[PDB]
Protein backbone atom coordinates (compact mmCIF):
# COMPACT_ATOMS: atom_id res chain seq x y z
CA UNK A 1 0.00 0.00 0.00
CA UNK A 2 2.86 2.47 0.80
CA UNK A 3 6.24 2.79 -1.01
CA UNK A 4 9.16 5.08 -1.87
CA UNK A 5 6.92 6.32 -4.70
CA UNK A 6 4.20 7.64 -2.27
CA UNK A 7 4.22 11.35 -1.41
CA UNK A 8 5.95 12.02 1.94
CA UNK A 9 3.05 13.86 3.58
CA UNK A 10 0.72 10.88 2.97
CA UNK A 11 3.25 8.35 4.43
CA UNK A 12 3.63 10.59 7.56
CA UNK A 13 -0.22 10.92 7.92
CA UNK A 14 -0.49 7.11 7.76
CA UNK A 15 2.22 6.88 10.46
CA UNK A 16 0.31 9.48 12.58
CA UNK A 17 -3.03 7.52 12.40
CA UNK A 18 -4.58 5.54 15.33
CA UNK A 19 -3.52 1.91 15.32
CA UNK A 20 -0.66 2.54 12.74
CA UNK A 21 1.85 0.51 14.80
CA UNK A 22 4.20 3.42 15.51
CA UNK A 23 5.62 3.00 19.04
CA UNK A 24 4.87 6.21 21.05
CA UNK A 25 5.15 7.33 24.72
CA UNK A 26 3.82 10.22 26.84
CA UNK A 27 7.30 10.81 28.47
CA UNK A 28 10.75 11.82 27.34
CA UNK A 29 14.17 12.10 28.97
CA UNK A 30 16.43 15.04 28.36
CA UNK A 31 20.07 15.55 29.26
CA UNK A 32 21.12 19.04 30.32
CA UNK A 33 24.76 20.05 30.89
CA UNK A 34 24.77 21.75 34.36
CA UNK A 35 28.10 22.11 36.20
CA UNK A 36 28.51 20.29 39.47
CA UNK A 37 25.04 18.70 39.83
CA UNK A 38 23.95 15.73 41.98
CA UNK A 39 21.11 13.28 42.43
CA UNK A 40 18.92 13.44 45.50
CA UNK A 41 19.41 9.71 46.29
CA UNK A 42 23.24 10.21 46.07
CA UNK A 43 23.04 12.99 48.75
CA UNK A 44 20.95 10.74 51.03
CA UNK A 45 23.42 7.79 50.54
CA UNK A 46 26.47 10.09 51.34
CA UNK A 47 24.82 11.41 54.53
CA UNK A 48 23.86 7.90 55.78
CA UNK A 49 27.45 6.59 55.21
CA UNK A 50 29.54 9.62 56.41
CA UNK A 51 27.48 11.34 59.13
CA UNK A 52 26.97 9.60 62.52
CA UNK A 53 23.62 9.49 64.33
CA UNK A 54 20.99 8.22 61.83
CA UNK A 55 19.30 5.04 63.11
CA UNK A 56 17.69 4.28 59.65
CA UNK A 57 18.07 5.72 56.09
CA UNK A 58 14.70 7.51 56.51
CA UNK A 59 16.41 9.92 58.96
CA UNK A 60 19.13 10.76 56.40
CA UNK A 61 16.35 11.57 53.88
CA UNK A 62 14.76 13.90 56.40
CA UNK A 63 18.15 15.70 56.91
CA UNK A 64 18.58 16.20 53.18
CA UNK A 65 15.06 17.73 53.11
CA UNK A 66 16.24 20.15 55.85
CA UNK A 67 19.27 21.01 53.72
CA UNK A 68 16.96 22.04 50.85
CA UNK A 69 14.70 24.11 53.17
CA UNK A 70 17.74 26.04 54.41
CA UNK A 71 19.01 26.74 50.86
CA UNK A 72 22.28 24.82 51.47
CA UNK A 73 21.24 22.71 48.41
CA UNK A 74 18.90 24.02 45.61
CA UNK A 75 16.45 22.53 43.11
CA UNK A 76 17.44 22.76 39.41
CA UNK A 77 13.75 23.01 38.36
CA UNK A 78 10.74 24.90 39.69
CA UNK A 79 9.89 22.52 42.58
CA UNK A 80 9.34 22.92 46.31
CA UNK A 81 9.30 19.46 47.92
CA UNK A 82 12.48 17.33 48.33
CA UNK A 83 12.71 14.29 46.01
CA UNK A 84 15.39 11.59 45.62
CA UNK A 85 14.97 11.33 41.80
CA UNK A 86 15.53 15.11 41.21
CA UNK A 87 18.91 16.84 40.57
CA UNK A 88 20.35 19.56 42.87
CA UNK A 89 23.25 22.01 43.05
CA UNK A 90 24.99 23.60 46.03
CA UNK A 91 23.72 26.85 47.47
CA UNK A 92 25.81 29.90 48.37
CA UNK A 93 28.45 28.47 50.71
CA UNK A 94 30.26 31.83 51.10
CA UNK B 1 34.06 9.63 62.63
CA UNK B 2 34.13 13.46 62.68
CA UNK B 3 30.67 14.38 61.39
CA UNK B 4 27.43 13.73 63.29
CA UNK B 5 23.84 14.95 63.58
CA UNK B 6 25.33 17.41 66.19
CA UNK B 7 27.63 19.17 63.66
CA UNK B 8 26.57 22.57 62.19
CA UNK B 9 24.57 22.00 58.93
CA UNK B 10 26.58 24.39 56.76
CA UNK B 11 29.81 22.60 57.74
CA UNK B 12 28.39 19.16 56.76
CA UNK B 13 27.30 20.61 53.45
CA UNK B 14 30.73 22.15 52.86
CA UNK B 15 32.36 18.75 53.70
CA UNK B 16 30.10 17.07 51.07
CA UNK B 17 31.07 19.83 48.51
CA UNK B 18 34.88 19.58 48.88
CA UNK B 19 37.05 17.79 46.31
CA UNK B 20 37.45 14.06 46.90
CA UNK B 21 34.47 13.85 49.36
CA UNK B 22 33.04 10.77 47.59
CA UNK B 23 29.72 12.52 46.63
CA UNK B 24 28.82 11.69 43.03
CA UNK B 25 28.97 15.21 41.50
CA UNK B 26 28.93 15.56 37.71
CA UNK B 27 28.32 18.08 34.90
CA UNK B 28 24.78 16.81 34.02
CA UNK B 29 21.20 16.24 34.96
CA UNK B 30 18.36 14.19 33.50
CA UNK B 31 14.83 15.53 33.31
CA UNK B 32 11.49 13.74 32.63
CA UNK B 33 9.10 15.78 30.42
CA UNK B 34 5.49 14.71 29.77
CA UNK B 35 4.96 15.10 26.02
CA UNK B 36 1.92 13.20 24.72
CA UNK B 37 2.56 11.06 21.62
CA UNK B 38 6.27 11.59 21.39
CA UNK B 39 8.55 9.03 19.62
CA UNK B 40 12.19 8.03 19.29
CA UNK B 41 13.93 8.43 15.94
CA UNK B 42 14.78 4.68 16.00
CA UNK B 43 11.09 3.81 16.18
CA UNK B 44 10.28 6.03 13.17
CA UNK B 45 13.07 4.30 11.24
CA UNK B 46 11.77 0.87 12.25
CA UNK B 47 8.16 1.73 11.22
CA UNK B 48 9.25 3.02 7.81
CA UNK B 49 11.49 -0.07 7.12
CA UNK B 50 8.65 -2.42 8.11
CA UNK B 51 5.65 -0.65 6.38
CA UNK B 52 7.01 1.23 3.30
CA UNK B 53 8.10 -0.87 0.29
CA UNK B 54 11.40 -0.10 -1.47
CA UNK B 55 14.07 0.25 1.14
CA UNK B 56 16.83 -2.16 0.06
CA UNK B 57 18.61 -1.63 3.45
CA UNK B 58 17.70 -0.12 6.81
CA UNK B 59 20.09 2.83 6.15
CA UNK B 60 17.83 4.00 3.33
CA UNK B 61 14.85 4.22 5.75
CA UNK B 62 17.11 6.27 8.07
CA UNK B 63 17.84 8.73 5.23
CA UNK B 64 14.09 9.01 4.48
CA UNK B 65 13.40 9.80 8.15
CA UNK B 66 16.00 12.59 7.97
CA UNK B 67 14.06 13.88 4.91
CA UNK B 68 10.86 13.95 7.02
CA UNK B 69 12.61 16.17 9.59
CA UNK B 70 13.97 18.49 6.87
CA UNK B 71 10.49 18.89 5.47
CA UNK B 72 8.82 19.70 8.84
CA UNK B 73 6.62 16.58 8.76
CA UNK B 74 8.31 15.56 12.00
CA UNK B 75 9.91 18.03 14.46
CA UNK B 76 12.66 17.79 17.19
CA UNK B 77 11.40 18.34 20.76
CA UNK B 78 14.40 20.67 21.43
CA UNK B 79 16.34 23.12 19.24
CA UNK B 80 18.48 20.77 17.09
CA UNK B 81 18.89 20.42 13.29
CA UNK B 82 20.58 17.08 12.53
CA UNK B 83 18.43 13.89 12.59
CA UNK B 84 19.41 11.30 15.26
CA UNK B 85 17.81 7.91 16.12
CA UNK B 86 18.32 8.60 19.88
CA UNK B 87 16.35 11.91 19.96
CA UNK B 88 12.59 12.31 20.63
CA UNK B 89 10.27 13.73 17.97
CA UNK B 90 6.64 14.87 17.50
CA UNK B 91 4.52 15.31 14.36
CA UNK B 92 4.52 18.60 12.42
CA UNK B 93 1.47 20.44 10.95
CA UNK B 94 -0.62 17.76 9.29
CA UNK B 95 -3.75 20.00 8.71
CA UNK C 1 44.86 15.95 28.40
CA UNK C 2 46.20 12.49 29.40
CA UNK C 3 44.22 10.06 27.20
CA UNK C 4 44.11 10.02 23.39
CA UNK C 5 43.55 7.77 20.38
CA UNK C 6 47.24 6.73 20.81
CA UNK C 7 46.68 5.30 24.34
CA UNK C 8 46.25 1.49 24.41
CA UNK C 9 42.54 0.53 24.43
CA UNK C 10 42.70 -1.66 27.56
CA UNK C 11 44.11 1.28 29.62
CA UNK C 12 41.39 3.66 28.33
CA UNK C 13 38.76 1.12 29.47
CA UNK C 14 40.29 0.64 32.93
CA UNK C 15 40.21 4.49 33.19
CA UNK C 16 36.50 4.57 32.24
CA UNK C 17 35.87 1.75 34.79
CA UNK C 18 37.57 3.53 37.72
CA UNK C 19 35.68 5.04 40.69
CA UNK C 20 34.90 8.69 40.17
CA UNK C 21 35.84 8.35 36.37
CA UNK C 22 32.78 10.38 35.30
CA UNK C 23 31.05 7.38 33.69
CA UNK C 24 27.39 7.09 34.84
CA UNK C 25 27.11 3.50 36.36
CA UNK C 26 23.93 2.28 38.07
CA UNK C 27 22.61 -1.07 39.29
CA UNK C 28 19.81 -1.48 36.76
CA UNK C 29 18.89 -2.14 33.16
CA UNK C 30 15.68 -1.93 31.22
CA UNK C 31 14.88 -4.66 28.69
CA UNK C 32 12.31 -4.24 25.93
CA UNK C 33 10.33 -7.31 25.09
CA UNK C 34 7.93 -7.85 22.24
CA UNK C 35 4.75 -9.44 23.76
CA UNK C 36 1.64 -8.97 21.57
CA UNK C 37 -1.47 -7.92 23.59
CA UNK C 38 0.17 -7.25 26.95
CA UNK C 39 -1.28 -4.56 29.27
CA UNK C 40 -0.51 -2.59 32.43
CA UNK C 41 -2.31 -3.37 35.76
CA UNK C 42 -3.48 0.29 35.74
CA UNK C 43 -5.06 -0.24 32.20
CA UNK C 44 -7.11 -3.21 33.73
CA UNK C 45 -8.18 -1.19 36.77
CA UNK C 46 -9.25 1.74 34.49
CA UNK C 47 -11.38 -0.59 32.23
CA UNK C 48 -13.20 -2.28 35.16
CA UNK C 49 -13.97 1.07 36.85
CA UNK C 50 -15.32 2.60 33.64
CA UNK C 51 -17.32 -0.46 32.38
CA UNK C 52 -18.50 -2.62 35.33
CA UNK C 53 -21.30 -1.06 37.49
CA UNK C 54 -21.38 -1.16 41.27
CA UNK C 55 -17.90 -0.28 42.51
CA UNK C 56 -18.22 2.44 45.19
CA UNK C 57 -14.78 3.87 44.28
CA UNK C 58 -11.58 2.95 42.31
CA UNK C 59 -9.98 0.94 45.17
CA UNK C 60 -12.69 -1.74 44.86
CA UNK C 61 -11.97 -2.00 41.09
CA UNK C 62 -8.27 -2.54 42.12
CA UNK C 63 -9.32 -5.38 44.50
CA UNK C 64 -11.38 -6.99 41.71
CA UNK C 65 -8.34 -6.92 39.40
CA UNK C 66 -6.25 -8.65 42.13
CA UNK C 67 -9.05 -11.27 42.23
CA UNK C 68 -8.62 -11.84 38.47
CA UNK C 69 -4.89 -12.52 38.99
CA UNK C 70 -5.54 -14.95 41.88
CA UNK C 71 -8.02 -16.80 39.69
CA UNK C 72 -5.56 -17.11 36.72
CA UNK C 73 -7.88 -15.10 34.45
CA UNK C 74 -4.94 -12.66 34.05
CA UNK C 75 -1.24 -13.58 34.49
CA UNK C 76 2.02 -11.85 35.42
CA UNK C 77 4.68 -11.90 32.62
CA UNK C 78 7.39 -12.45 35.24
CA UNK C 79 7.22 -14.74 38.31
CA UNK C 80 5.37 -12.56 40.85
CA UNK C 81 2.43 -12.99 43.24
CA UNK C 82 1.24 -9.56 44.34
CA UNK C 83 -0.91 -7.52 41.97
CA UNK C 84 0.60 -4.12 40.99
CA UNK C 85 -0.77 -1.42 38.64
CA UNK C 86 2.73 -0.67 37.34
CA UNK C 87 3.44 -4.28 36.20
CA UNK C 88 2.63 -5.86 32.80
CA UNK C 89 0.07 -8.69 32.40
CA UNK C 90 -1.33 -11.06 29.75
CA UNK C 91 -4.66 -12.94 29.60
CA UNK C 92 -4.89 -16.43 31.06
CA UNK C 93 -6.42 -19.43 29.40
CA UNK C 94 -10.02 -18.40 28.66
CA UNK D 1 -24.59 -1.02 30.89
CA UNK D 2 -24.63 -4.78 30.86
CA UNK D 3 -21.77 -5.64 33.21
CA UNK D 4 -21.80 -5.31 37.00
CA UNK D 5 -20.29 -6.64 40.22
CA UNK D 6 -23.02 -9.39 39.98
CA UNK D 7 -21.71 -10.71 36.61
CA UNK D 8 -19.59 -13.90 36.73
CA UNK D 9 -15.88 -13.04 36.71
CA UNK D 10 -14.89 -15.22 33.74
CA UNK D 11 -17.47 -13.47 31.52
CA UNK D 12 -16.22 -9.98 32.57
CA UNK D 13 -12.65 -11.01 31.65
CA UNK D 14 -13.69 -12.43 28.23
CA UNK D 15 -15.53 -9.12 27.57
CA UNK D 16 -12.33 -7.15 28.50
CA UNK D 17 -10.34 -9.45 26.20
CA UNK D 18 -12.55 -9.02 23.12
CA UNK D 19 -11.52 -6.89 20.10
CA UNK D 20 -12.74 -3.24 20.47
CA UNK D 21 -13.47 -3.72 24.26
CA UNK D 22 -11.73 -0.36 24.99
CA UNK D 23 -8.86 -2.03 26.89
CA UNK D 24 -5.57 -0.26 26.32
CA UNK D 25 -3.15 -2.91 24.94
CA UNK D 26 0.46 -2.65 23.75
CA UNK D 27 2.83 -5.06 22.00
CA UNK D 28 5.98 -3.86 23.82
CA UNK D 29 6.76 -4.27 27.47
CA UNK D 30 9.65 -3.10 29.60
CA UNK D 31 11.24 -5.21 32.34
CA UNK D 32 13.70 -3.83 34.96
CA UNK D 33 16.58 -6.15 35.89
CA UNK D 34 18.94 -5.37 38.76
CA UNK D 35 22.45 -5.65 37.14
CA UNK D 36 25.26 -4.19 39.24
CA UNK D 37 27.43 -1.54 37.55
CA UNK D 38 25.67 -1.50 34.18
CA UNK D 39 25.76 1.49 31.78
CA UNK D 40 24.15 2.78 28.63
CA UNK D 41 25.96 2.65 25.33
CA UNK D 42 25.24 6.42 24.90
CA UNK D 43 27.09 7.26 28.21
CA UNK D 44 30.08 5.28 26.93
CA UNK D 45 30.17 7.34 23.76
CA UNK D 46 29.69 10.66 25.77
CA UNK D 47 32.59 9.71 28.15
CA UNK D 48 34.98 8.84 25.37
CA UNK D 49 34.18 11.99 23.34
CA UNK D 50 34.58 14.16 26.47
CA UNK D 51 37.89 12.60 27.82
CA UNK D 52 39.86 11.05 24.97
CA UNK D 53 41.65 13.48 22.58
CA UNK D 54 41.83 13.00 18.80
CA UNK D 55 38.14 12.38 17.86
CA UNK D 56 37.28 14.86 15.07
CA UNK D 57 33.50 14.27 15.59
CA UNK D 58 31.24 12.23 17.87
CA UNK D 59 30.80 9.44 15.30
CA UNK D 60 34.48 8.47 15.64
CA UNK D 61 33.90 8.05 19.42
CA UNK D 62 30.99 5.68 18.62
CA UNK D 63 33.23 3.67 16.25
CA UNK D 64 35.73 3.43 19.10
CA UNK D 65 33.00 2.16 21.48
CA UNK D 66 32.19 -0.52 18.90
CA UNK D 67 35.92 -1.42 18.92
CA UNK D 68 35.69 -1.96 22.67
CA UNK D 69 32.72 -4.39 22.35
CA UNK D 70 34.59 -6.43 19.64
CA UNK D 71 37.63 -6.75 21.83
CA UNK D 72 35.50 -7.91 24.79
CA UNK D 73 36.53 -4.94 26.94
CA UNK D 74 32.83 -4.21 27.30
CA UNK D 75 30.02 -6.81 26.99
CA UNK D 76 26.32 -6.85 26.03
CA UNK D 77 23.83 -7.79 28.84
CA UNK D 78 21.63 -9.71 26.31
CA UNK D 79 22.60 -11.77 23.23
CA UNK D 80 23.13 -8.96 20.69
CA UNK D 81 26.19 -8.79 18.45
CA UNK D 82 26.24 -5.21 17.11
CA UNK D 83 26.89 -2.11 19.22
CA UNK D 84 23.86 0.14 20.03
CA UNK D 85 23.69 3.36 22.03
CA UNK D 86 20.24 2.37 23.43
CA UNK D 87 21.41 -0.98 24.93
CA UNK D 88 23.01 -1.70 28.36
CA UNK D 89 26.59 -3.03 28.82
CA UNK D 90 28.90 -4.11 31.64
CA UNK D 91 32.72 -4.26 31.72
CA UNK D 92 34.65 -7.39 30.60
CA UNK D 93 37.48 -9.05 32.61
CA UNK D 94 39.84 -6.19 33.45
CA UNK D 95 42.67 -8.23 35.02
Numbering used by the authors:
A (entry chain D): 416 to 509
B (entry chain C), D (entry chain A): 415 to 509
C (entry chain B): 415 to 508
Sentences from the paper on this structure:
Wnt signalosome assembly relies on reversible head-to-tail polymerization by the N-terminal DIX domain of Dishevelled (Schwarz-Romond et al., 2007), which enables this hub to transduce Wnt signals to cytoplasmic effectors. Here, we use structural analysis, as well as biophysical and cell-based assays, to show that the DEP domain of Dishevelled undergoes a conformational switch, from monomeric to swapped dimer, to trigger DIX-dependent polymerization and signaling to β-catenin. This occurs in two steps: binding of monomeric DEP to Frizzled followed by DEP domain swapping triggered by its high local concentration upon Wnt-induced recruitment into clathrin-coated pits.
Purifying lipoyl-tagged DEP (Lip-DEP416–511) by size exclusion chromatography (SEC), we observed two main peaks, corresponding to monomers and dimers (discussed later), in addition to a higher mass species. Interestingly, the solvent-exposed “underside” of the connecting β sheet presents a hydrophobic patch, made up of a triad of hydrophobic amino acids (M443, L445, and I447) located at the DEP finger tip of the monomer. The hydrodynamic radius of the dimer determined during SEC-MALS confirmed that its shape in solution is larger than a typical globular fold of 44 kDa mass, consistent with the extended configuration of the swapped dimer seen in the crystal. The dimerization defect resulting from mutating E499 and D460 can be rationalized by a striking salt-bridge network between their negatively charged side chains and the guanidinium group of a key arginine (R472). Notably, E499 is located on the loop between β3 and β4, and its salt bridge with R472 appears to be mainly responsible for tucking this loop under the DEP core.
